[PDB]
Amino acid sequence: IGTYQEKRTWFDDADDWLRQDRFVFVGWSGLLLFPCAYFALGGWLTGTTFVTSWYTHGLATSYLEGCNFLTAAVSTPANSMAHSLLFVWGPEAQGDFTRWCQLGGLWAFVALHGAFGLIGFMLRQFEIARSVNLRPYNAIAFSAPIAVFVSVFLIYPLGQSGWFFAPSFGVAAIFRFILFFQGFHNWTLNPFHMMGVAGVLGAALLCAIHGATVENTLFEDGDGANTFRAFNPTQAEETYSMVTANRFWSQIFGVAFSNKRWLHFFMLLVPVTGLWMSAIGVVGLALNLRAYDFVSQEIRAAEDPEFETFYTKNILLNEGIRAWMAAQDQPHERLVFPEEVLPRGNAL
Amino acid sequence: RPNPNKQVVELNRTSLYWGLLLIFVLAVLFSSYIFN
């Protein structure tokens, strides 16, 4: 059936069945995407619904214990496990299930199955693009979320002392992670995070302007005020005036797009670059390579007691966060800070 | 023997402006950290 018109085998029949068009496109990558993603979602839900974190973190995080949607999470394993893969059949759990769920292995289960689900999803995007005969720019775009997930949930915990310092799958847990980076890593001051936030805000800006400009430069292709109905999806004529939009934005802003392909490629390119740079910054953080302090200003402040800048105030705030949060954030250190050593504004 | 695979690179004024803006913005962002 191929180039040389040869016979058909098991692989041919499997390929014909898998790629058959239906409501739910399975594809070859479906065998990987569907079970992994299904078990990731199931693990997250059954963990945030029944499983607790009393023994791993000393916290109560579940619906059964009385937490709502915002303060429920699947917490990471205890710091004692370090970087253990923590299989249900592993030496830690010895095959037991209730101990395994009680020991924090459900986080590792969810994270690993979700990562493989992401891989399967990108493979599915590739398969769909090949089937429809289109350039697979969607997979190139989706590369950035995978990079962010790998940097934050896998590479960073591996660089640290264990899975304990990974983000936990929950809203309040993510907020804790964010504040932890602020207090300890000075993550706001890292230039890579600056480039990432610039990219994300620029992507939102581009989306807003493109939508408004397209919707405010339509051609009068029909009667009535409801312009949405005046559009035929099979038409071969442009639905908005590129020349008018170009002139308007060149006279308002100063520079305006003149190529549709370049415009949409720029929309694709900005956020992908932003999150890739954020991922590189997080990779740098994983090894404690922090853009924490400016040596010149620190020396000047130490020498001159009258020297104050917003940078020094941020340093003081970070020190306060660290000292007041590490007491309960990291139980395995067994830190007991006397009330007289905690940093505190003396004014009271 | 002359090579059939011969091509010329082009860079319109918009690309030049984009590149200059990119390098100057990167220098502005990273100068504070490089000087420390």
């Binding site: 100063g254 | 402006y17 100057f24 502005v28």
Partner: peptide, 30 residues
């Protein structure tokens, strides 16, 4: 010294912005 470098960088960026706004390639066949 470093303040002069920062000022030069900012002035150069502003000059590039001005040139891009004004001395632009005229768009044809939009």
């Amino acid at each position: 010294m470093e303040a002069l470098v920062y000022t030069f960088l900012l002035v150069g960026t502003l000059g590039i912005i001005f040139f891009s706004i004004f001395f632009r390639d005229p768009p044809r066949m939009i």
